[PDB]
């Protein structure tokens, strides 16, 4: 899909009105063709994808807008799809060369503080500047009235551009201020090189530096380059999210480059005194971060991964490495933020159709496509893994399921097999496959600041992004031919993660890694402040304030929720602690609250709700001091995107 | 736009009930197929996954007919092999519509036996045990979040033999958790088929010998409010004609006096005459303020414009329905041009023309050419007061006799006189009786919708929405009366007619308490008479919920209530009640929006967090939730609440 211009906002002194130029059918066709003959006029376009509508402002002969709406998408144009000229994920800014007929606003350098925000409804909202990227609405408005206006201009009185709107600053679901991308960030972006080669590892610098390495999985980014550095005489640490990949490196390196390295995972540890160590991020955090002077170079592998341990591990390194004596951090991934999937030479891509004995996410699989050989099928849930595995087994296909919870020994490693699995596979098992068949959806978690009474953490099924598609497809075609089959050809933009991931980081810090919320904030802040990494909204003070209130948890419930191994074991266990001390029942008797089951006969009355982590069946009271505390925390300034 | 089959749910041949889905169309194919109404793909399976541009749900063929929900499909056609298929059955009251099953389509068959173990099929092909507890209700064996059931409406409930018991249309929820499911029984599908496919309501009924409720679906200028009661009067019957508009009511009476001979009784706030005639013209508000039906006074009651869903009208009609038989009436007539289920058909006096981007006057993303309005009598419907004032301004500056009209302004500001462009809200339709050479329609209106948002209680939010058939049909109606007329529009779209939000029920209790001295219990009886009567606009049964809420709100401040009644805005009771609770705690209102002006003079003495009862708009001030009324309302949210799927 391409981005499509579906209207415009005309400026004149400052007033505006808007014009629509496409309906739905036109938008969709134009988005599939990427061919737009419609004449472009104005400095503000109203634009749309198949999922959202927003604005775009031309400045300096460039049409600009937000990464969180456009991603890395092309813009439909007279002669076809227009590739983006600039892609600055870190500033939430992208830009296409202005098409013929378009006008540009000029930047503002008189430096006025009385500003005017233009919306998708063509209203003109006065704004008092507060900083480089903040302004306060003179009249607070409900957040919903700014929705769809991301990308609109912030104008000084003389009509020039100060920047583009990117998000509202809410206080309890009401917008008192606005975040914008300032015109100086636009000019900085324009002077940066479009091509920047991150395929070569850099040489060790004289003083501390953070460098990026974008290279295919099996370039030797985690094998050959660590070996090269060690030859030059350095001590190198390779961090990786998979236990099975970390272990695998030990045997590979001892054969191929004659180095028997240190290995550090939770299930196994080996110290050989070698100058190269391979660790998981999680085991790295358990060992208490950087040891003063132990390493010259730290290589954070798969730094595209947006799981809490990886983010927390990488932010720890970014906070500590210099102080502990390192000269070099290398952030390594094949799929960096802003990447899209491109054709792979070694992999042949074939859409699924409706003909097939095996129904699969609305489409079908031919039994002839998986009868012999080794094939991997990605499903979104374990329930689905289980039922597809059973089907296949009943047809006499040798088929097995894999997901979080199961021992990887369900393998088999040699022989005909179909593996039906979730993304747990990515970290659990390292082999590749004659084909990958991919449902193209993922389970993820999303926070909702629902003030009912506090927040909600919802589990939802959503389309895959560009990293998911590439990483799943990349389980076939490794040094040998391969096939990838898909239910749908789409792709969400890569490199963003939800605020629940942040909440997860504080939770794990408390549950697993003996980190105070203040400590956790320091480490995440280094992650945020370092560019070229995945991006999120800055909700650190909020989440810090919330967990900071969660005191004197019951150690047995914590142990039990960690043991059962599910999400947010600290939030779950803290709610259970409050329920037990208040002598009151849990929100439900879902498996989530089984730590309270022996107390079931004696718990009665309304649940002192702290927050929603699933369905709430029981009645709730709001009188508990901890609830009162978390409600007060919601008055904090919260960026939400528009 | 037609409904389009975009996929299907395939049920298992034997053993235990299981299913899987197949998708036969993408988005592009869906949109094209909806605009042409032509679907050459063949129809397999008995459970279809259907879609409009706006939403998607399920449809289930039983005994020859592809059934689904009115709240999903409205009166729309089904895309077919030889073009659009019109609906064969349209039952607004049961939330059930039906197209004749296309070629070779397969139909489930009814639950002949009579088990009480049931299985619901969802759009995800999940099969979910249900326990029948009534004709149209069964409980989920394992309660679920209601989000999981959205888009499954129209799906079947099966008995273990795989026979259809009905089709899902809504969940019963407790605080966001579906505990049970509502369906349209299969025998309500056969009650639908053992009626005639066409019913006639174009002629006023004969007076029956015993109490009967009849419907009159006939256009304005058929004389529904002048000629027909005149006719009944001529046969010696006493007749009451009720209407939502003061100006319409006065006009009919004045027309009757000079044309049909009679000098009728008139009853409104502003003018009331007793002449002893056997025809009486009243508004719904005055009828209610008079305490409803007085014994033996009328044989016939015409409830005119019975399509209207303002609180007064609903409350008024509810009253007549509850009180007429016992007051000795023989006949209640529910009269409208635009009954529930109706569609905007072409009018031979009216030339319909799409606005373009060509024009000097920007209008809702399109354009009005000055030529089209420079000379004559013209009407422009805008959704908000604000826009009307912007558009009157922008028009007159360019040399026009432009004027606005919306609630608050006195009519007569609309002259006549000749050349004019009136820019107005829908308030035009209760304030002014005249018509125009052309009508220009923004195709949108403001409405109010309730969210059970548990933050802490409920929210009532003003939103802007696409117009429905009634809206479009009534807005067009102000041109092409006798002579030729023109209708210009921004959008061809049209939402289904005859549904109203739960917030409208809220307004009925509020008006009950604020204007007409009705206890919540007394209002429930009246509303119950309206729901139970068929062929009237329909809503979700939340009567107990809303009764329970207003029953708690006692000892309101008489002064604030008088000011919110006078200012004329919605929910004067809830607004005044929140203010009563604020003033008594010396706390500020949730904001300093105009809604809270009754409290402006006390601003100096009002400090601290607002004890919030519910949300009627943005809340800027901190909130406490400790107030006994807040808690009382919080407990009411435990009620069983039907919500759609
Ligand atoms: C410029 C501020 C930075 N924190 C930032 C950078 C890029 C993007 Cl897409 C940002 O917004 C989101 C919004 C939702 C999810 C992730 C990120 C974002 F908030
Ligand atoms: C059969 C139950 C009846 N109360 C009923 C009849 C028709 C329809 Cl469209 C119903 O559903 C709605 C849903 C939303 C708004 C109004 C009505 C509905 F609830």
From Swiss-Prot, chain B:
Question: What cofactors does the UniProt entry give for this protein?
Answer: Zn(2+); Mg(2+)
Q: Which residues bind Mg(2+) 1?
A: 225, 305
Q: Report the co-factor binding details.
A: Binds 1 zinc ion which has a structural role. The magnesium ion is essential for the helicase activity.
Tell me the residue ranges located in the Cytoplasmic compartment per UniProt: 17-645
Residue limits of the Helicase ATP-binding domain? 205-357
Pinpoint motif DECH box by residue range: 304-307
Q: How does it assemble?
A: Interacts with protease NS2. Interacts with non-structural protein 4A; this interaction stabilizes the folding of NS3 serine protease. NS3-NS4A interaction is essential for NS3 activation and allows membrane anchorage of the latter. NS3/NS4A complex also prevents phosphorylation of host IRF3, thus preventing the establishment of dsRNA induced antiviral state. Interacts with host MAVS; this interaction leads to the cleavage and inhibition of host MAVS. Interacts with host TICAM1; this interaction leads to the cleavage and inhibition of host TICAM1.
- Name this protein carries in UniProt: Serine protease/helicase NS3
Task: Report the catalytic activity.
Answer: Hydrolysis of four peptide bonds in the viral precursor polyprotein, commonly with Asp or Glu in the P6 position, Cys or Thr in P1 and Ser or Ala in P1'; a ribonucleoside 5'-triphosphate + H2O = a ribonucleoside 5'-diphosphate + phosphate + H(+); ATP + H2O = ADP + phosphate + H(+)
Binding of ATP: at which residues?
Answer: 218-225
Coverage of the whole protein, first to last residue?
Answer: 1029 to 1690 of 3010
Q: Which membrane topology term applies here?
A: Peripheral membrane protein
Q: Which residues are involved in binding Zn(2+) 1?
A: 111, 113, 159, 163
In which compartments does the protein localize? Answer: Host endoplasmic reticulum membrane
